[PDB]
Design a protein around this ligand. Structure first.
Ligand SMILES: [Mg+2]
Ligand SMILES: [Zn+2]
Ligand SMILES: [Zn+2]
Ligand SMILES: [Zn+2]
Lengths: 36, 81, 142, 171, 97, 650, 112, 262
DNA sequence: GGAGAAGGAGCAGAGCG
DNA sequence: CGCTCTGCTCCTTCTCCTTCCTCTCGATG
RNA sequence: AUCGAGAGGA
């Protein structure tokens, strides 16, 4: 993987357990072999 | 039964390949070389050169179906490949 | 037995004395290879010289073995060793049984019967009687 | 006792020594590995008869590496004992319970269960020989021992030297 | 990557015995074991620091050989032993000539 | 250390229970595997295949790296049937005299004498079984065939035999006058059968004795066969076998417990069946009947048979085929500028796959530099191995510039140019789908092949993937280059035709290039020649001289073809003038007639490709393909070719 | 006669698709199916029920059912098969392994 | 499934085909011990054509006018004409070819005259013409004696087998029966003089070459023929077909049994 | 579900009484 | 010719049986 | 981690 952190989400379920969701984004630059 | 060997005098390709690979292996082990060096660091190239002019000291043991076998010195064999 | 030459060689029940003499010859051959690269006291020292001129002295145990084998020698002198061979073989004597009589001392036929139970049952006394005293005199010559 | 037999040994050689000198080097290696050998089938191996005429019988090069095997045939002089045999041995070491005697290239242990009941250990002698009966046995003397079976071990081979007999006794 | 059946078939076709062996032995599953000559079962106590070996049930201390086999193969036999099967491996062909 | 050998023959048979007991180094008594980290002496003890960091393995130390496990011992309270042998036991018992130790029939009946004559033991047993199974009585006196009035007092029992029925895990004997047979009875019966009977029955007295079909003790495979499981936070959930063994042990203790405590005859029976059940499912959790052992999780218990039988089992999934290292897989692409026996490999791949090259006086200087470059550069190596086995990792050390190489040391050299490698396109339908090429490293992430090599691979650049394998020993390297090399397969034994050729654009160009009207200005000819790597530096004389120096296309193309070639193809219209310029005729590496097309550079056996392979050898034919493609492509690039809707409009 | 008819019959199938296969590859298959004195199919009930080494047979479609038989008859595989040596991880006796390489020491001492 | 059937089938150094058990399947691989990689389709001239045409193309008579050898063909003209000794040699060959004609009529009942055979004679011959630009306008130095002996001598050197015993020697004769018929077809003296005006030097080269090429083309021992045969049938199958399945599985209950009564 | 093995059941003929 | 015998035929059971990789997803001891 | 199931390529 290679990217930068986009949006870090911290929440909890109904049970009070702490949740963490992290979105990492990157730019796909058409390479040799990429299908079309 | 060296007298009247019933197998070909020609070297079958499998023997060519295996002999070349082996001799390359011994050469890589710093074993004594039997020909002059023209700069072929490639042990396998040394091997083909060696085989071409018959200085391999190897004899092929060919196994017949019954388990009996014949011995063919590489010098005896005809390199037709 | 059979050698690795494909030849069914007979089981060579080698006599102690003839074994020592064959070992002497083999050591002489070994010393020949290195170069190309009798009383029991006389033979004991002579072989030790061969051992020291063919090895480095590490094999002390055998040097003891030959020295002790030479001490219990019965027929040190080979051309006499041949004589007993002809005497014993003329009777069709069994090679394994042959070894003991050539390697062990015995004066009378009965004594051999006592020493070797195998002879006790099937051997002819006359053969032992004539042979053993002939060999006893030969042994006394040593 | 002593036997001449055309025996063979399997020897492996590293490629670097595959020069024509390999014949003599292999001759050596066989000589070291053959002589001074104990074995249940043949007992002990004294020497190699016909030190020349080395039966190399072609080298078996392995596919794993450049190492090759050599089942080199050879005539050797070996020692083989048998049960109930007579040998005029010599006492190598003494013991309160008997003796250990040299029987060819083999070691034989005299056991007190099997010597004349009237013979007793005399610690007063030097060496502490047995002197209570006719069969006086000491390190410096001569002894005949009856081979009451060969007790072959993993590391060495030895047998029982029995003395309680009209023959195969002291000296 | 799984060198599957169809792949080794080609190597058989090409006859690349040396290569086929390398792909199945050196590439993975390399494993050394010791075996008893009396019984062909991997039941050898290998006191390597002592160079001492033995096959309990045969008390054999001289018939010990080193063999290189696929680690998976070792599992198969050991499972066969668990199956009440005796996969005895012998290194000397019964037929001579 | 110990002598090395190789496997020659494998002998199969059944364990002798005393042999099992002797082999085992520990008896198993406790179904319990555990107080916090110590193992019960009666199960999973260090005497077995001890767990990591425990250097016991029955005083074998070495961890689990150089030491396998060892088998345990379980003493069955009662004998039990072996599942795979239930039918075999059934048939055998149908043949024995049922508490006599003898066979129902004898050699005095000619029918068995015919059966006994059978060399094949398997057929022999079946032949006898067909006869004995019909013999429901073992009368002592049997009239002799030679003397009908004389009878042979053979049958010891002299009684009748019951019909045997396979009642699930147990046999039932229907007496012609009915009861459940006893495992003990059968065991004794087998123990009273003679060796001479084994020969007729197809049993080996020293490897396969019929009584051994019945199990009296169970070997206990060590942990390595049922590995300790730590998939979760130190949660065991041991393999099914570990739990399955516990079930047997729990059953074994209970059956023993019941018998000892009060001898509740009936309760003993159910337990014995439970034992026969658990052992049966343990060996095979799949039977013709309903019974299906289930793990506490609710899923079926995975028995030994499940481990082996079926695709992905221990046989097909790990022995005939397996995962391997020193390999790679990616997507391919075309590149005419590469020869048939070549391939493009990304710098990234070569930077990872390595070869264990051996240091010698002939390359120590080169290898020295590679180590200096280290694993970060392409032309370098990852590991330096001393003769002692010191696998130095250049990744985590500055010693790359300090280590002094020594002869005999191994270096994990990166893949470099001209290193033979093996390719494979899944599925490997037939021989051609795997061939050996040469490596040229390139700066992008894909595999480049010469266009022509695709046809045998059945490949296509629409996103197809293809596998790469690298040999590790000099032995194999030589093997591939001489057996699996690309050129060696140009003529396929599939149909006696060349399997390769010019395809796609390059084929189209040649038609135009060799077309009668195609003439080339001097400017182009100068370049086209130079593209031919084999060009000798001698400009051919232009066909047209006076009005303007021109070369007909055929002239240039002939340059690529080596000298000494002679092809003669005649069509219906070929009459040494070819008014349609059909047919084909090449003389001494020079085109004269015809328009070069599919039937001369294609797959056809009469084509040029087939001829060249035989007059010069593949090592020369391979160089041809590059020459043709390099030339035509260059001309086509400067000529161009397209299609469009107009092409379809009439 | 059946062998010939079988070959002729299969030829129609291969030819019907427009593909072409050498006679050598085709005849061999036809021969193998009849060497046992009968039309031995190549299913589980044909080729499998041969007298070849069990360790080879166990990998076709049935594994445990065959192993059990080996123990019953105490089978002794010869290891002459290819797959058998594959399982053991030993060099198969084929191709480059269909012979042996030996060092002709006599020739070695011939070359100084 | 097919591969499993033929894994262990391989060719031994005795030029035979044995399975793992050593059971012999084909005594000589493919009934000719010939590699599939070294064989290509070629014509059999002696099969087709009318009998008179056949005689014209091959028959030579030094005594009569119908099949007179044209003196301009060779440096020796009338020296050859009338020589009964040479006529006998021609008679033997012509009779030999006649047997081949009627013989091959039986082998290939359909009369087809194009079959795979090793060593492409035509290409060797054409190569011969281009080796040193044979001047095809001058008489050659060849003699009938040389041609007839050359043909026979070549045949004696087509050694597929090595066993000196009668049994092996008999097999060798049957192994190359078809191939040697082709040689006697395309090396007939009449053609060797008219169609291909070779020199003595050239003709010696051709015979030497054919033998040399032929030996290279014999199937090598150690081949894993069964695997090659298995795959070779396979890739056809991945392109009728249910029938193939119906064949490999014997399946007595054929879907469409039928008869062809003549 | 097919396909093949398997085992039983009936049955008629062939020899016997 | 009935009896008996035996193979012969028939007639249900009663199994066991099908290229390579890439990700995600929910539930388990 | 496995198993199970699914989606998608070659
Ligand atoms: Mg595609
Ligand atoms: Zn053992
Ligand atoms: Zn262990
Ligand atoms: Zn009975």
């Amino acid at each position: 993987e290679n990217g930068i952190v986009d949006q870090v989400l911290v929440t909890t379920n109904q049970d009070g357990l702490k949740f963490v969701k992290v979105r990492v984004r990157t730019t796909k630059i058409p390479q040799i072999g990429d299908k079309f | 039964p060296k007298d009247q060997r019933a197998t070909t005098p020609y070297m079958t390709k499998y023997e060519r390949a295996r002999i070349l690979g082996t001799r390359a292996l011994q050469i890589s082990m710093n074993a004594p070389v039997f020909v002059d060096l023209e700069g072929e660091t490639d042990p396998l190239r040394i091997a083909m050169k060696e085989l071409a002019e018959k200085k391999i000291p190897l004899v092929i043991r060919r196994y017949l179906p019954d388990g009996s076998f014949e011995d063919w010195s590489v010098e005896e064999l005809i390199v037709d490949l | 037995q059979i050698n690795h030459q494909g030849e069914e060689e007979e089981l060579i029940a080698l006599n102690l004395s003839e074994a020592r003499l064959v070992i002497k010859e083999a050591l002489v051959e070994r010393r020949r290879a290195f170069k190309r690269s009798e009383t029991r006291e006389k033979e004991l020292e002579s072989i030790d010289v061969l051992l020291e001129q063919t090895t480095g002295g590490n094999n002390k145990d055998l040097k003891n073995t030959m020295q002790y084998l030479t001490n219990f020698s019965r027929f040190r002198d080979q051309e006499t060793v041949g004589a007993v061979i002809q005497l014993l073989k003329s009777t069709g004597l069994h090679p394994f049984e042959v070894a003991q009589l050539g390697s062990l001392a015995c004066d009378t036929a009965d004594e051999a019967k006592t020493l070797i139970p195998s002879l006790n049952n099937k051997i002819s006394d006359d053969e032992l009687e004539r042979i053993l005293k002939e060999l006893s005199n030969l042994e006394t010559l040593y | 006792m002593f036997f001449i037999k055309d025996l063979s040994l399997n020897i492996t050689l590293h490629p670097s020594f595959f020069g024509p000198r390999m014949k003599q080097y292999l001759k050596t290696k066989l000589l070291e590995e053959v002589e001074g050998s104990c074995t249940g089938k043949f007992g002990y191996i004294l020497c190699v008869l016909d030190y020349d005429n080395i039966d190399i019988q072609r080298g078996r090069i392995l596919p794993t590496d450049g190492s090759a095997e050599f089942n080199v045939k050879y005539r050797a002089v070996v020692f083989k004992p048998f049960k109930g045999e007579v040998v005029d041995g010599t006492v190598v070491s003494c013991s309160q319970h008997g003796f250990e005697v040299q029987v060819g290239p083999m070691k034989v242990f005299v056991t007190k269960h099997l010597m004349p009941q009237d013979l007793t250990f005399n610690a007063g002698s030097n060496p502490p020989s047995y002197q209570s009966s006719e069969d006086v046995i000491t390190i410096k003397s001569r002894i005949r021992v009856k081979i009451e079976g060969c007790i072959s071990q993993v590391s060495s081979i030895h047998a029982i030297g029995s003395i309680k007999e009209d023959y195969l006794g002291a000296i | 990557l799984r060198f599957g059946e169809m792949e080794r078939d080609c190597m058989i076709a090409h006859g690349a015995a040396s290569f086929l062996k390398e792909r199945l032995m050196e590439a993975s599953d390399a494993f050394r074991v010791h075996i008893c000559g009396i019984c062909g079962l991997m039941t050898v106590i290998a006191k390597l620091n002592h160079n001492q070996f033995e096959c309990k049930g045969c008390d054999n201390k001289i018939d010990i050989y080193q063999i290189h086999i696929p680690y998976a193969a070792k599992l198969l036999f050991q499972e066969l032993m668990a199956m009440n099967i005796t996969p005895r491996l012998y290194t000397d062909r019964s037929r001579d000539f | 250390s110990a002598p090395l050998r190789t496997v020659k023959e494998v002998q199969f048979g059944l364990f002798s229970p005393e042999e099992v007991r002797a082999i085992s180094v520990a008896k198993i008594r406790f179904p319990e595997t555990m107080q916090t980290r110590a193992k019960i002496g009666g199960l999973n003890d260090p005497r077995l295949g001890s767990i990591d960091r425990n250097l016991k393995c029955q005083t074998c130390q070495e961890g689990m790296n150089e030491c396998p496990g060892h088998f345990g011992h379980i003493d069955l309270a009662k004998p039990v049937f072996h599942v795979g042998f239930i039918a075999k036991i059934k048939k055998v018992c149908e043949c024995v005299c049922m508490h006599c130790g003898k066979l129902l029939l004898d050699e005095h009946n000619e029918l068995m004498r015919q059966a006994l004559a059978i060399k094949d033991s398997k057929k022999r047993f079946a032949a006898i079984w067909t006869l004995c199974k019909t013999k429901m009585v073992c009368e002592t006196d049997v009239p002799s065939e030679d003397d009908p009035t004389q009878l042979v007092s053979r049958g010891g029992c002299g009684n009748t035999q019951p019909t045997i029925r396979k009642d699930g895990l147990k046999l039932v004997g229907s007496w012609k006058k009915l009861r459940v047979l006893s495992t003990e009875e059968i065991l004794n019966i087998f123990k009273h059968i003679s060796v001479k009977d084994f020969t007729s029955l197809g049993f080996n007295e020293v490897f396969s004795r019929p009584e051994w079909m019945i199990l009296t003790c169970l070997p206990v495979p060590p942990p390595p066969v049922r590995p300790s499981i730590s998939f979760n936070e130190s949660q065991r959930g041991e393999d099914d076998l570990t739990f399955k063994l516990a079930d047997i042990l729990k059953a074994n203790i209970s059956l023993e417990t019941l018998e000892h405590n009060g001898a509740p005859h009936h309760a003993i029976e159910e337990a014995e069946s439970l034992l026969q059940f658990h052992v049966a499912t343990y060996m095979d959790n799949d039977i013709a009947g309903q019974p299906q052992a289930l793990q506490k999780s609710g899923r079926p218990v995975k028995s030994i048979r499940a481990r082996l039988k079926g695709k992905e089992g221990r046989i097909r999934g790990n022995l005939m085929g397996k995962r391997v290292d020193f390999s790679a897989r990616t997507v391919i692409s075309g590149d005419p500028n590469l020869e048939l026996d070549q391939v493009g490999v990304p710098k990234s791949i070569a930077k990872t796959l390595t070869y264990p090259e051996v240091v010698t006086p002939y390359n120590i200087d080169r290898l020295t530099q590679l180590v200096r470059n280290g694993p970060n550069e392409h032309p370098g190596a990852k590991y330096v191995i001393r003769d002692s086995g010191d696998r130095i990792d250049l990744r985590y050390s500055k010693r790359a510039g300090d280590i002094q190489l020594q002869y005999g040391w191994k270096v994990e050299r990166h893949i470099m140019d001209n290193d033979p490698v093996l390719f494979n396109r899944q599925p490997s339908l037939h021989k051609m789908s795997m061939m050996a090429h040469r490596v040229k490293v390139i700066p992008y992430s894909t595999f480049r092949l010469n266009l022509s090599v695709t046809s045998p691979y059945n490949a296509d650049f629409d996103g197809d993937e293809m596998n790469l394998h690298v040999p590790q020993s000099e032995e194999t390297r030589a093997e591939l280059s001489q057996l699996c090399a690309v050129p060696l397969q140009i003529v396929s034994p599939q149909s006696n035709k060349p399997c390769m050729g010019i395809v796609q654009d390059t084929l189209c160009g040649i038609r135009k290039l060799t077309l009668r009207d195609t003439f080339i200005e001097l400017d182009q000819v100068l370049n086209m020649l130079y593209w031919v790597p084999d060009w000798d530096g001698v400009i051919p004389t232009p066909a047209i001289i006076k009005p303007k120096p021109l070369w007909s296309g055929k002239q240039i193309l002939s340059v690529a073809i080596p000298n000494g070639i002679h092809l003669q193809r005649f069509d219906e219209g070929t009459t040494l003038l070819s008014p349609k310029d059909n047919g084909m005729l090449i003389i001494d590496g020079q085109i004269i007639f015809g328009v070069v097309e599919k039937k001369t550079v294609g797959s056809s056996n009469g084509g040029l490709i087939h001829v060249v392979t035989r007059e010069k050898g593949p090592q020369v034919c391979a160089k041809l393909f590059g020459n043709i493609q390099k030339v035509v492509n260059f001309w086509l690039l400067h000529n161009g070719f397209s299609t469009g809707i107009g092409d379809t409009i009439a | 006669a059946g062998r010939a008819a079988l070959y002729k019959e299969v030829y129609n199938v291969i030819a019907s698709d427009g593909s072409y296969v050498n006679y050598r590859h085709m005849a061999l298959l036809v021969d193998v199916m009849t060497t046992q004195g009968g039309l031995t199919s190549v299913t589980r009930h044909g080729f499998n029920r041969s007298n070849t080494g069990a360790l080879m047979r166990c990998s076709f479609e049935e594994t445990v059912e065959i192993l059990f038989e080996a123990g019953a008859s105490a089978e002794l595989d010869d290891c002459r098969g290819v797959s058998e040596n594959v399982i053991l991880g030993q060099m198969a006796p084929i191709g480059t392994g269909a012979f042996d390489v030996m060092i002709d020491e006599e020739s070695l001492v011939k070359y100084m | 499934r097919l591969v499993k059937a033929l894994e262990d089938i391989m060719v031994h150094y005795d030029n035979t085909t044995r399975n793992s058990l050593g059971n012999v399947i084909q005594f000589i691989y493919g009934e000719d011990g010939m590699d599939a990689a070294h064989i290509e389709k070629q014509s059999l001239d002696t099969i087709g054509g009318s009998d008179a045409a056949f005689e014209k193309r091959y028959r030579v008579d030094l005594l009569n006018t119908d099949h007179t050898l044209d003196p301009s063909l060779l440096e020796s003209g009338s020296e050859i004409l009338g020589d009964l000794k040479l006529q006998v040699l021609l008679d033997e060959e012509y009779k030999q070819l006649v047997k081949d004609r009627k013989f091959l009529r039986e082998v290939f009942v359909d009369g087809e005259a194009n079959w795979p055979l090793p060593v492409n004679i035509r290409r060797i011959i054409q190569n011969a013409q281009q080796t040193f630009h044979i001047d095809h306008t001058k008489p050659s130095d060849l003699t009938i004696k040389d041609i007839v002996l050359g043909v026979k001598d070549l045949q004696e050197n087509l050694l597929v087998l090595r066993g000196k015993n009668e049994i092996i020697q008999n097999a060798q004769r049957d192994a190359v029966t078809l191939f040697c018929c082709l040689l006697r077809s395309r090396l007939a003296t009449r053609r060797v003089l008219q169609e291909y005006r070779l020199t003595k030097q050239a003709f010696d080269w051709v015979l030497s070459n054919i033998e040399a090429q032929f030996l290279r083309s014999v199937v090598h021992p150690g081949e894993m023929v069964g695997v090659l045969a298995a795959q070779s049938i396979g890739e056809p199958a991945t392109q009728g077909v249910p029938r193939l399945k119906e064949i490999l599985n014997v399946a007595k209950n054929m879907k469409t049994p039928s008869l062809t009564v003549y």
